[PDB]
Amino acid sequence: LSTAILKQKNRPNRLIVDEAINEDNSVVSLSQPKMDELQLFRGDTVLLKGKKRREAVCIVLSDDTCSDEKIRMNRVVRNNLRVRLGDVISIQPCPDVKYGKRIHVLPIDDTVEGITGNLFEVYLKPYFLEAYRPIRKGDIFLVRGGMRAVEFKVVETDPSPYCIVAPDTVIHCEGEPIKREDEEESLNEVGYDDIGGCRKQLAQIKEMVELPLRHPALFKAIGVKPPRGILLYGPPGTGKTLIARAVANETGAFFFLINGPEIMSKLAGESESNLRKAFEEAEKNAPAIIFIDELDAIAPKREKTHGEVERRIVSQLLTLMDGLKQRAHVIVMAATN
Amino acid sequence: LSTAILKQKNRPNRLIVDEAINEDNSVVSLSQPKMDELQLFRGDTVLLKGKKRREAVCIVLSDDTCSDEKIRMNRVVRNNLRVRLGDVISIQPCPDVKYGKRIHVLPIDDTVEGITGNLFEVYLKPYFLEAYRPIRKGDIFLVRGGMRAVEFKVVETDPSPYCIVAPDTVIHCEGEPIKREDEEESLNEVGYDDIGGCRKQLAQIKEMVELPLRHPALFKAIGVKPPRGILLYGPPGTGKTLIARAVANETGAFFFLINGPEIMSKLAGESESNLRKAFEEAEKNAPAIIFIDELDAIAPKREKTHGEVERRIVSQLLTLMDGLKQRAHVIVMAATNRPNSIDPALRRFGRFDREVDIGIPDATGRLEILQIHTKNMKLADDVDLEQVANETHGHVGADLAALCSEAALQAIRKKMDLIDLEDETIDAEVMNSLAVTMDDFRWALSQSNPSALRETVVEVPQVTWEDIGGLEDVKRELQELVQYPVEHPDKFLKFGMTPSKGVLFYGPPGCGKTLLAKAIANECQANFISIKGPELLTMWFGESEANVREIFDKARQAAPCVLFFDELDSIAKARGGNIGDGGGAADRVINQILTEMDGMSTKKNVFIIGATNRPDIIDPAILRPGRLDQLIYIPLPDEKSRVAILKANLRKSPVAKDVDLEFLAKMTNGFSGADLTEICQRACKLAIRESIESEIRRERERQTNPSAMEVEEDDPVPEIRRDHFEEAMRFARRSVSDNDIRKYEMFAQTLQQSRGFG
Amino acid sequence: RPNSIDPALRRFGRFDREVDIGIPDATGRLEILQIHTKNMKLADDVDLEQVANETHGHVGADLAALCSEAALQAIRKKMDLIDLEDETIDAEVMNSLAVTMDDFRWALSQSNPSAL
Amino acid sequence: RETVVEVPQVTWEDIGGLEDVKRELQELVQYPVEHPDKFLKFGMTPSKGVLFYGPPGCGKTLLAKAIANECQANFISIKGPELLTMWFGESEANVREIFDKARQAAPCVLFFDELDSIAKARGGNIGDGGGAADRVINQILTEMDGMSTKKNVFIIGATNRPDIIDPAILRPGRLDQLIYIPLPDEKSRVAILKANLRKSPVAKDVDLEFLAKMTNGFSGADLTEICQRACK
Amino acid sequence: SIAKARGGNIGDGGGAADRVINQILTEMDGMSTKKNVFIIGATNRPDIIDPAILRPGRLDQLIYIPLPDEKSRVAILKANLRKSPVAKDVDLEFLAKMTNGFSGADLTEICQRACKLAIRESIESEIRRERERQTNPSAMEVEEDDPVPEIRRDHFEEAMRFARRSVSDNDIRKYEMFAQTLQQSRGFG
Numbered sequence A: 001l002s003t004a005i006l007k008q009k010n011r012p013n014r015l016i017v018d019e020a021i022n023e024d025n026s027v028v029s030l031s032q033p034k035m036d037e038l039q040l041f042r043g044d045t046v047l048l049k050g051k052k053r054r055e056a057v058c059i060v061l062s063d064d065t066c067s068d069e070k071i072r073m074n075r076v077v078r079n080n081l082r083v084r085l086g087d088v089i090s091i092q093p094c095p096d097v098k099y100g101k102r103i104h105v106l107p108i109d110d111t112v113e114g115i116t117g118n119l120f121e122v123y124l125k126p127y128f129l130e131a132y133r134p135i136r137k138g139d140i141f142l143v144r145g146g147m148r149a150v151e152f153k154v155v156e157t158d159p160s161p162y163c164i165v166a167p168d169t170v171i172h173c174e175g176e177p178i179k180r181e182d183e184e185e186s187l188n189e190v191g192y193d194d195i196g197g198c199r200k201q202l203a204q205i206k207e208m209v210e211l212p213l214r215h216p217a218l219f220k221a222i223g224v225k226p227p228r229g230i231l232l233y234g235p236p237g238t239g240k241t242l243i244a245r246a247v248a249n250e251t252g253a254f255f256f257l258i259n260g261p262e263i264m265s266k267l268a269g270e271s272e273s274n275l276r277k278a279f280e281e282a283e284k285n286a287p288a289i290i291f292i293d294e295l296d297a298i299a300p301k302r303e304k305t306h307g308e309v310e311r312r313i314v315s316q317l318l319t320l321m322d323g324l325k326q327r328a329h330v331i332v333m334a335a336t337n
Numbered sequence B: 001l002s003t004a005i006l007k008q009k010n011r012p013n014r015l016i017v018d019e020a021i022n023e024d025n026s027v028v029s030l031s032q033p034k035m036d037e038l039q040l041f042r043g044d045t046v047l048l049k050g051k052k053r054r055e056a057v058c059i060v061l062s063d064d065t066c067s068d069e070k071i072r073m074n075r076v077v078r079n080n081l082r083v084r085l086g087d088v089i090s091i092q093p094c095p096d097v098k099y100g101k102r103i104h105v106l107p108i109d110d111t112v113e114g115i116t117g118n119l120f121e122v123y124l125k126p127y128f129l130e131a132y133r134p135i136r137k138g139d140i141f142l143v144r145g146g147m148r149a150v151e152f153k154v155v156e157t158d159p160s161p162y163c164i165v166a167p168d169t170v171i172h173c174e175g176e177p178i179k180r181e182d183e184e185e186s187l188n189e190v191g192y193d194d195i196g197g198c199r200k201q202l203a204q205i206k207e208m209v210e211l212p213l214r215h216p217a218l219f220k221a222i223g224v225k226p227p228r229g230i231l232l233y234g235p236p237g238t239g240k241t242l243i244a245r246a247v248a249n250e251t252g253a254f255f256f257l258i259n260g261p262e263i264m265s266k267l268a269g270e271s272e273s274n275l276r277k278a279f280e281e282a283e284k285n286a287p288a289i290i291f292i293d294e295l296d297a298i299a300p301k302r303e304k305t306h307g308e309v310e311r312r313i314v315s316q317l318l319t320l321m322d323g324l325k326q327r328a329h330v331i332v333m334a335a336t337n338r339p340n341s342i343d344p345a346l347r348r349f350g351r352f353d354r355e356v357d358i359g360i361p362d363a364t365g366r367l368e369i370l371q372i373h374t375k376n377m378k379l380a381d382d383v384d385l386e387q388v389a390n391e392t393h394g395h396v397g398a399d400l401a402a403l404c405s406e407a408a409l410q411a412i413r414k415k416m417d418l419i420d421l422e423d424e425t426i427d428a429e430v431m432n433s434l435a436v437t438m439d440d441f442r443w444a445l446s447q448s449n450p451s452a453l454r455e456t457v458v459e460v461p462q463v464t465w466e467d468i469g470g471l472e473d474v475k476r477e478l479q480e481l482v483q484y485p486v487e488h489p490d491k492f493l494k495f496g497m498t499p500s501k502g503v504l505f506y507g508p509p510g511c512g513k514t515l516l517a518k519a520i521a522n523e524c525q526a527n528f529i530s531i532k533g534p535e536l537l538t539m540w541f542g543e544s545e546a547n548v549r550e551i552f553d554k555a556r557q558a559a560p561c562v563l564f565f566d567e568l569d570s571i572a573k574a575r576g577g578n579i580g581d582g583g584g585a586a587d588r589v590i591n592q593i594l595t596e597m598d599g600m601s602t603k604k605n606v607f608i609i610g611a612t613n614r615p616d617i618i619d620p621a622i623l624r625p626g627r628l629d630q631l632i633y634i635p636l637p638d639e640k641s642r643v644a645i646l647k648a649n650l651r652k653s654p655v656a657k658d659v660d661l662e663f664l665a666k667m668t669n670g671f672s673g674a675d676l677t678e679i680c681q682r683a684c685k686l687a688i689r690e691s692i693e694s695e696i697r698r699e700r701e702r703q704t705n706p707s708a709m710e711v712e713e714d715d716p717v718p719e720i721r722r723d724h725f726e727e728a729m730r731f732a733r734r735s736v737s738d739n740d741i742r743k744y745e746m747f748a749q750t751l752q753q754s755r756g757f758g
Numbered sequence C: 001r002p003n004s005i006d007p008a009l010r011r012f013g014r015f016d017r018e019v020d021i022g023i024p025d026a027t028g029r030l031e032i033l034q035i036h037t038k039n040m041k042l043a044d045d046v047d048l049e050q051v052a053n054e055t056h057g058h059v060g061a062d063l064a065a066l067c068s069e070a071a072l073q074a075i076r077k078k079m080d081l082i083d084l085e086d087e088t089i090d091a092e093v094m095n096s097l098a099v100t101m102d103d104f105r106w107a108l109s110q111s112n113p114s115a116l
Numbered sequence D: 001r002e003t004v005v006e007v008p009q010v011t012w013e014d015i016g017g018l019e020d021v022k023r024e025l026q027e028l029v030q031y032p033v034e035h036p037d038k039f040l041k042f043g044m045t046p047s048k049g050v051l052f053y054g055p056p057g058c059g060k061t062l063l064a065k066a067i068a069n070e071c072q073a074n075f076i077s078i079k080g081p082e083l084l085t086m087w088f089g090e091s092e093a094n095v096r097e098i099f100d101k102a103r104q105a106a107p108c109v110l111f112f113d114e115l116d117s118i119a120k121a122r123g124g125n126i127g128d129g130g131g132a133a134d135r136v137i138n139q140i141l142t143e144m145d146g147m148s149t150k151k152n153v154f155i156i157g158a159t160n161r162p163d164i165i166d167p168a169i170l171r172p173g174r175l176d177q178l179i180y181i182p183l184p185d186e187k188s189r190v191a192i193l194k195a196n197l198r199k200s201p202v203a204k205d206v207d208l209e210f211l212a213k214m215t216n217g218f219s220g221a222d223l224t225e226i227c228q229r230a231c232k
Numbered sequence E: 001s002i003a004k005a006r007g008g009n010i011g012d013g014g015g016a017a018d019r020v021i022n023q024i025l026t027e028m029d030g031m032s033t034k035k036n037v038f039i040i041g042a043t044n045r046p047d048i049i050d051p052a053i054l055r056p057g058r059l060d061q062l063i064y065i066p067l068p069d070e071k072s073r074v075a076i077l078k079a080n081l082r083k084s085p086v087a088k089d090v091d092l093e094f095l096a097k098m099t100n101g102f103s104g105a106d107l108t109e110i111c112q113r114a115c116k117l118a119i120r121e122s123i124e125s126e127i128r129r130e131r132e133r134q135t136n137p138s139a140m141e142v143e144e145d146d147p148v149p150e151i152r153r154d155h156f157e158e159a160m161r162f163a164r165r166s167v168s169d170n171d172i173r174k175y176e177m178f179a180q181t182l183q184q185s186r187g188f189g
């Protein structure tokens, strides 16, 4: 039970992906007892949750040749949810529908180059007019209203979770296109599937960091105070900054990063201000995490320290660590070798 | 009388709480001779005093079914006075009644949410109009003028001690409500009931700090100047900041706090201003206390200090300490965990001359710390805290806190198939089905790595005389050497004899020398410091002079104690050599031991005992009058001594009636106590082998016919029957040869002659 | 610390004379005790020459702390009447304070001196 | 240049002979892990130490790896050459770091090895001005005393020069269970030669019994030398 | 201790001259005679002594202090026994005629043993009195005096039984041979 927190806990609302034969980019395949199970009436908009906090919404259909344990979707949704073939995806009935005021799509330029022509009346007309197709802020969808695959990206939108775009919602095309590198660099984010060989330690870090921030009521009920500092250590090259970025992309808390050399490279009296601003922004915001990377660059032993300014930075860090109270909901974790 | 200041001193005006059946929140229950005793007329307002300086006032009633020794009140007064069921509360007749001008209540928002409605005409009307109900500034009272329990809090009021609210007193409801966390955090303040394992030191701190501030007239009358500096010290984690906050919440003096890193983290020239403002605000105000926490961060030794600004901060602190005069009524107390890295100019007379040593707790202390920390957890009935308190050996208070936390997290992990990290909230039955069992405390105790394992243990031992077999003449001699100068001082003054201080035990290995030295300390109820030559050849090469002075200073501080040196052959054979070498018969460590043993005053009751099993390479300079004098040779045991040893080792395990110990001692000839313990341990291991093999045969037989599984057997072996001792007798080998025994006889007769030549 | 002073200050014309205040002997310790106990109210049992013989490595401030610890022991024996909880103490209790030889034996048992 | 803390891969099957010590090492190591309460029925506290000593080449390292493979425990290995190096630069930290790492990775067998190099660089050949107690082995004894029994750290030693050994190592509460590992017998030599020859294919014309009846004082290292010569 | 931590037992690589005793000789040379500082030494191992200590203008006047004679032993036993009161039944002359190679430390050991035996009898007698008063506490009417004020005799006989000799006779003839000729150690050997 030492690694029991890493179990996926399969439930009736768990849906495994599979290949879908519909070229429409708003389809799901659910069976009739599944729609009668979660009270999903025909035409509902569910809230799909994938990996690395990416989400998606699609209008539901009753594809009765689907199985009760799976779901079928195309490559567009599986790239908007960052899943492979054979990964679970939660479903949530969220019919809280409000319309949008203005949406703002943006194309990707390398497919627009070649021939552009007119973007609006050739590309944005036949896909949006009388379709009611839902979007999330940050989706990449494909319209075959041109020469070949020219993709669009919804960036600026006033409804932030999602919205069903009515035909009266104002559609623009005046903005600036996006590069291919801008998406392909953001497809190289880090999750828990990029860490190998450290299962037993990821169990401990999820028990120490994720659980006292999602459920403070348990620790208050059973009478436990959660820890305030975690120190990762190891040899050089063993993946400590990687586990840092993995928790930074999962956890659903506010994340703030402090580097050792970046603090110590600044002028005297500006580095203490950066430490104070870090802890003030973390206590001001949500349940938070502060990651201090390379701790032994900003706080060595005081037999090695010769300056006055470096002893002042160590004493500043001690004073800021003692200010964390049980009310604050701030975890500080640091890494060293 | 060393802890006589911690006595509660029961008086006729002492009232023990009890449960009251009146739902009214202004009732007390007093008997008629109590009201005729303190001249309490019916309808008086008394001044009730509880814990942590909380007070309360209630109008008195004559409830004659109450007892003369108790009082009865509800939960409202017992939460306004911070007492439990079975705690004393002083009463004071204070009829000094003046009315209030404006009062200002404030609700608590979590009970107001749900439905609020109109607060004033529904909540504040029927409880205040024509009631004359008294309040203290800071009370939490309950009015049933709504949906459920909606509590109010009186914050702003012009009469500060208390007041009887007339109906003409202006009542407001416009203010801001208070959160639940704002009260529940302030219910976690610290008193003297949150400190466990430090009774003897709390006595000293109340004699030094509370008494010269409450009653300066006594110290001026008898002619005593009270001290100005107290230095608490100890290992990390032993509760020094906790004792600080406890005095900060009791004492009834002005309290000011200074942190080490908070002073040293500021810019140059701003830290000296914070020190000066601290002492100016303390001398400006009342009888005060200044607590300087982590003193060794702002004043280290000036060989370590490299700055100019840090030497200026140390000199500023010395100048401010010398400005304290007898007129001022200011006590300065400081806390550190590195008591030898403080600048030595601060530890002189007039600055930080008193020192109180908070130490590592023993088993009785660990039980009290565990009972304090688990008062909010929900323990199962299986949990025995005395077993846990015995099994935690090198722990300090913070380690026991981390032990309780790790146990409850294990209890969560066993309940993981219901709790989801993915969801929003947890079922209330899952939050109610949490109870920590003894299996959790065994997990948490298996995982914990404590902090104070590499410290020296100063305790009273647990070995009685009964664990030792044989050696009865040396029991009669050691009683006469140790116990009578403690118990009968004057009988050495009738004659002209000064008692001796040293004993040396020497002999063959395994003969039982350590247990006697522990047993005499258990007999006299003295402390016991144990040193080993391996432990003293390590941590000398790094600190070349301090180690043996630290041992003798710690033994002088913890008097009366027996200071037991042991394993002297390792010093003698790492420095003096096997067949002799270029090194001396005198050894550097044993040299500094002789120097420390000479300068030891006889008014102390520190008694020194040695032990070696290589008496030939011993230093001659150890043996001289005024040092280790009383040579006692401890020999191999005789056969009745061997029967007594075998009766001694066999008390924990159950054996049968078929065994004969007399024949078993008549088989062994040169066998020590270690060899007889080896035989008993071999026999127990053979019995455990047979038990496990029998259980394997039973489980395989149940696997053979699992259709019935109907044996329902009992325990196949509860004891050792016989004949394991025969195989153990076959295994045994002798430890000391006979040539060595005649050599020990020849050193047994004449070792005192080794002083001169040879 | 007479050997940590800069040696240029101890030359001719600057700090050439030196007077060595030292650790007192038994005749000195008796005089220090008779000075410090001139305001205390001693019982008739107290023999200061025995105390002056039994204090071996003490200097003057140690004898001051010895007298203070003795009088605090005399307070602790009178503790069942004195209340920390109250406001003031009865004048007969402040008049019934007199330090006996048992107190000086307690205080002398507890003291750890400086110049051993 | 790091210390490897893993579960080893040597099974019992790689070792030939020495079956009584297999039955003894199971009883010393495996039962206090597997059956805690059966030591609470009686009043016995289990021991913590084993010393193996004997002639060279007899097969002492493989047993210590094999018991760790049997119990599924970690395995830290130390050599006296490795501990006389990186002591002269860090005079006190090294042996504390080893025992702290073994306490952190519990349950593990902590295998000291090659004690003759410490004993012969400090204690000497025919004796000298140095002691029978050695500074490194002194700090080892200090670290071995202050070790709590709630942990399941088990200590195993090995030397092939048992005369210059420190007497202070051997005392109850330290390395107790002395086991002498002898030269192998002829059926033990047949088992050793069956053990070394499993990786390489050999024919049916070979006789191992005669080949063990030729060797008299030959250890396992010598029989492995013979097999390696044949493959070359 | 200086001679045996630096000069050694049977000799070693160290010298007969020792570093501390070297600096002592240097300080003893540069000492003006107008001062009245007088230096006295003591050792009980006269063989490994530095030869350089003994030279004119340094520690000159060698005095060998021997084992005491029997009238010297009577004087020693009169000296140790002045603090404690003893009786008139004791004979010190026979008690010195029993001891042969016994020093002053041994005679002080005998006297200390006798005082310890007397204190044992005193405490055991008080325990019997308190238990007898516990037996019949209804009266409690003895009002006894002091059962033992002095040492009577016969504790010295048990103390005589305990005693062991401190210096053997081989050592005494070795000290005689160093007593006659120690000044000749300056040259060779």
Ligand SMILES: Nc1ncnc2c1ncn2[C@@H]1O[C@H](COP(=O)(O)OP(=O)(O)OP(O)(O)=S)[C@@H](O)[C@H]1O
Pocket (backbone or CB within 6 Å): A194, A195, A196, A197, A198, A235, A236, A237, A238, A239, A240, A241, A242, A243, A336, A337
């Ligand atoms: N467990 C691992 N799984 C996958 N990739 C890893 C793992 N450990 C290291 N890597 C790779 O190693 C690269 C460097 O790892 P880092 O996280 O930079 O190491 P580090 O922990 O930061 O060590 P230092 O002290 O900062 S040099 C990462 O970018 C990964 O590509």
Ligand SMILES: Nc1ncnc2c1ncn2[C@@H]1O[C@H](COP(=O)(O)OP(=O)(O)OP(O)(O)=S)[C@@H](O)[C@H]1O
Pocket (backbone or CB within 6 Å): B194, B195, B196, B197, B198, B235, B236, B237, B238, B239, B240, B241, B242, B243, B336, B337, B369, B372, B396, B397, B398, B401
């Ligand atoms: N005697 C004790 N009784 C009850 N709780 C204790 C005791 N000693 C320590 N604790 C607990 O240990 C926690 C930490 O103790 P601290 O007071 O922080 O130790 P400390 O004395 O400050 O040591 P340092 O030098 O400051 S790290 C406290 O919050 C208590 O929970």
Ligand SMILES: Nc1ncnc2c1ncn2[C@@H]1O[C@H](COP(=O)(O)OP(=O)(O)OP(O)(O)=S)[C@@H](O)[C@H]1O
Pocket (backbone or CB within 6 Å): B467, B468, B469, B470, B471, B509, B510, B511, B512, B513, B514, B515, B613, B645, B648, B649, B672, B673, B674, B677, D171, D172
């Ligand atoms: N008289 C005795 N009664 C009971 N147990 C004894 C007795 N004598 C020895 N022992 C046992 O002998 C073992 C070692 O005891 P110790 O006194 O520590 O031995 P030692 O005299 O110190 O010699 P070493 O060098 O430690 S083996 C323990 O198991 C004791 O229980």
Ligand SMILES: Nc1ncnc2c1ncn2[C@@H]1O[C@H](COP(=O)(O)OP(=O)(O)OP(O)(O)=S)[C@@H](O)[C@H]1O
Pocket (backbone or CB within 6 Å): D014, D015, D016, D017, D018, D056, D057, D058, D059, D060, D061, D062, D160, D192, D195, D196, D219, D220, D221, D224
């Ligand atoms: N019983 C055995 N079974 C298999 N191989 C063995 C056996 N005994 C020894 N060997 C071989 O002997 C060689 C050395 O093994 P080790 O146990 O390391 O020797 P050792 O006892 O440590 O003595 P040294 O000092 O290292 S040569 C290896 O090649 C082993 O395969």
Ligand SMILES: [Mg+2]
Pocket (backbone or CB within 6 Å): A240, A241, A293
């Ligand atoms: Mg990194």
Ligand SMILES: [Mg+2]
Pocket (backbone or CB within 6 Å): B240, B241, B293
């Ligand atoms: Mg603290």
Ligand SMILES: [Mg+2]
Pocket (backbone or CB within 6 Å): B514, B566
């Ligand atoms: Mg011992």
Ligand SMILES: [Mg+2]
Pocket (backbone or CB within 6 Å): D061, D113
């Ligand atoms: Mg090997």
